[PDB]
Nucleic acid binder design. Structure first.
Lengths: 73, 331, 329, 323
DNA sequence: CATCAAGCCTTCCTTCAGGTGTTGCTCCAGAAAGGGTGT
DNA sequence: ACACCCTTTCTGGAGCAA
């Protein structure tokens, strides 16, 4: 680990304003009047997962030419 | 909808930057300790990446008015001049929560975490005022986006882009203005000056005696508060031409018409602050709608469909949307 | 295919960071307890490894827009400016599962887990929009990698590599912008100001007495309704600096490249990463390089004729049936 | 309401700018060190943007009177000319704190951190003087908005509106004016000029030897100094602005403007420096000034007449009352 | 119509104001059970 | 009659660095 570990927050939110605009315009056929950030399509979820800058070292028995071909891909 | 308002302040601009800043009597900002320093209230400053010298982008200070301040200026302009007269000429009245939500985005400092229904969201974004400033206990996205007031300067050439080489500004655009508060009682001169004071000479002499006692206490401290206060505040110099970028992602025609009506009624409005020194007075010299210049001496010229839309909507304006917009779901 | 967009933020960038960060009345961020502090919500900073001033690498703060935010911004630009007009103009319509799958990659339309054969996986990855992002109930892998919006900065150099030494920003790229909410009942100054209010002076004075009672209760407690007066801060990335943004395509069709190009053609009307009421994130595109070939002009993207023609025939055949069969079955 | 009080100074205007500025015996302002320097107290000046190269606009100096100074001048002529005669005529006597809140913004340097009631805010912003000038312990906002006194100059061509271009003056508008203070013992010259001096000849000799001992090694009376002033006869303008005023407040402003003819602007009281005459008063763009004072604006004068009648001390008292 | 005069001294700042109050975040990031009712 | 929608209902801890 070249750096100390950090944590990345990412969120999943469905655009509530765009959902209401599409629901009036008819492009979204949603019969539901009220959304729910708790659960459902409009669940604004938060999830935090670790992040590391590092150098990755692995050891294996294989032909170098194919391994360098795959790793250059 | 892209709106670009080039204004010209004819008084100094003072949007006070928060902080504890000081200045010497000679004019040096934030001196090292030991030398005598006076409180300086600097104007609001945006750091901008700019091209200093040749191909050397650096962070330079450029003194601005915040987009929150100009957004509330736009809001209170269309509120005092358009929305409130439309509510006054009919029987509609707002609750104190509805007034608070219309003027500051919320009725209480605590929002409710539930969001509102899609029908109410759609009708509030279709509203002329509530669509621009969507706040409330359930946070809506308002389609009005209001940028900061940037001075047309070299330091904002990566902000401004092309088309702004005319009436160009270089160098420092700010100035420290010093203000003093004298004690009125030291300016008393005779018994005719003191006859309006209860007690007169006795009360005046008591004021001098408390000032002498407080000065002796302060001298014992160094080697309450009186009314002598010599201090400073940094303002942005008058005469600058400023850019103000107003944006509206798919607006109702009445909403951009309401922005146009507010820009019409920006006459006799103060931009930032320093009210009693007449700071913030300005003259709009240009408004371009999607790059098309629509400003004349008699306000906005052209753009007629926006004005008929906002006239029809103000004729249809009522207090019901304001009341149910401010109505908390938890309350 | 490696599309690479060089942009310049005309307005500040404010991608909000988690945690309870605080700042004093001056610029001291996170003071020790025992001094007056204000809630600061900072920009999205990540610690990156850089070799500047030394041969070894160190951890430097780099203020970026997340690749998730840019990926969903590209997705919403694609939908709002290309896909929703195309589905509207032929009268196609989306159910809530298809809408959630297309606009958020979300699987709640069919949360049971849709089985996918390799043939329909191949046709769905060859779809102009579905193959870019994938996901939803079928959990499909998209063809699109969207990098973070990395500022052209000396902290970002190992990320950026060579070719960015000129016009390279140095020093701090952030500034704390202070925002306050004023209680507007305090700004009621005349009978004309309060005449719109129901109750008028009585309701205004009731609000004043409520504010004084709440302030006295807070002062007594410090020795639960919150008022409208607030003074807070938000740290933004300063406007006018140059960013780069890498969108890689893992073996695309020309229609998918044309869809990314049409998204970038209509992207200046969008906003990068929040700060919406303060117009934050407004930007111009300074350049677009398609595998190193600089392809952007003032009038959008010139060239790339095969991609634009392929996405034109893709949009002419773009129906919601593919979206509904990608979501449900 | 937008009032433009365009005036012309009879005598050189001197608003002392802060700073340790210096001058040589010539007209070199702030010289490099190593040359004979004298303390120069420059006039207050404002940087203004002005078109200097016929395409290029640049920040140039322009000597002004601050809007704080002119606001306090307007407040003081209202107080000493209109408010105090109405108060002592009816027998009303303010407190010492109320007097301090009238002439300054408040009585104490610590304002209260509470907001006042809306009924109080409405009564004081409907009051003439307290509506014009807010402040107090609870931070009232006045309806009066006082700009700086700007000379009609080509440096202010982006500051003024239209119609001032024929009157607009070019060139430098300042002078380093020299002053000196003698030690007057050196000017005695006669033994009958020390009969008024206690001690007399021995006292004058002691003062001379004290001056010689001070010059060999307290500050004496020998001073030679300079102050930069705006030149007299300059045509100015003064932008008073009103945020939704009552007619009594406008009448109070016009009553103050009618009798500023014997009032001094900024500093230089011993040198009669602040003297000026009012060339014109524009009332929302319409000229209302003549030789005898303000003509027209009759509803404002009648409103301030019925407002000055019944002017009570208790409004000032509960404006100055802390919380 | 030519010079000779073609300054000399000394002043060369003094006190004081040299901030006050507030703000000093808000909310939510769940999924199933159990009812309706609308196609 | 089986699909989506709109509501309740429900169990525990607690310290905190840059």
């Amino acid at each position: 680990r070249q750096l100390p570990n950090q944590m990345w927050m990412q969120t999943g939110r469905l655009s509530i304003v765009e959902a209401a605009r599409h629901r009036q315009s008819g492009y979204l056929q949603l019969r539901a009047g009220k959304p729910n950030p708790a659960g459902g399509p409009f669940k604004t979820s938060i999830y935090h997962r670790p992040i590391v800058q590092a150098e990755l070292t692995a050891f294996c028995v294989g032909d170098q030419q194919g391994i360098e071909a795959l790793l250059s891909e | 909808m892209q709106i670009e308002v080039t204004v010209r302040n004819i008084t100094p601009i003072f949007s006070a930057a928060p902080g504890s800043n000081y200045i010497t009597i000679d004019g040096t900002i934030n001196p090292p300790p030991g030398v005598s320093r006076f409180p300086l209230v600097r104007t609001r400053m945006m750091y901008v990446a700019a091209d200093v010298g040749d191909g050397v982008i650096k962070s330079v200070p450029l003194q601005i008015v915040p987009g929150n301040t100009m957004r509330s200026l736009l809001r209170r302009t269309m509120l005092k001049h358009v929305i409130e007269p439309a509510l006054v000429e009919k029987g509609n009245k707002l609750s104190i929560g509805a007034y608070a939500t219309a003027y500051s985005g919320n009725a209480t400092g605590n929002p409710d975490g539930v969001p509102s229904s899609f029908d109410e969201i759609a009708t509030m974004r279709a509203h002329p005022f509530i669509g621009l400033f969507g706040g409330g206990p359930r946070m809506l996205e308002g389609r009005l986006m209001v940028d900061s007031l940037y001075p047309i300067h070299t330091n904002a050439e990566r902000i401004l882009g092309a088309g702004y080489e005319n009436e160009m500004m270089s160098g420092p655009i700010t100035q420290v203005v010093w203000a003093r508060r004298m004690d009125p009682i030291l300016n008393l001169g005779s018994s005719e000056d003191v006859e309006v004071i209860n007690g007169g000479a006795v009360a005046a002499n008591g004021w001098i005696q408390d000032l002498l006692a407080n000065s002796k206490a302060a001298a014992s401290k160094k080697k309450g508060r009186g009314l002598k206060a010599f201090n400073a505040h940094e303002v942005v110099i008058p005469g600058l031409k400023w850019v103000w970028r107003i944006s509206l992602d798919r607006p109702t025609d009445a909403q951009v018409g309401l922005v146009l009506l507010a820009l019409n009624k920006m006459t006799n409005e103060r931009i930032a602050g320093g009210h009693s020194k007449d700071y913030g007075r300005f003259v709009i010299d240009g408004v371009s709608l999607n790059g098309e210049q629509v400003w004349s001496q008699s306000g906005i010229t052209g753009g007629e469909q926006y004005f008929d839309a906002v006239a029809e909507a103000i004729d249809g304006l009522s207090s019901k949307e304001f009341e149910q917009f401010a109505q908390s779901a938890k309350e």
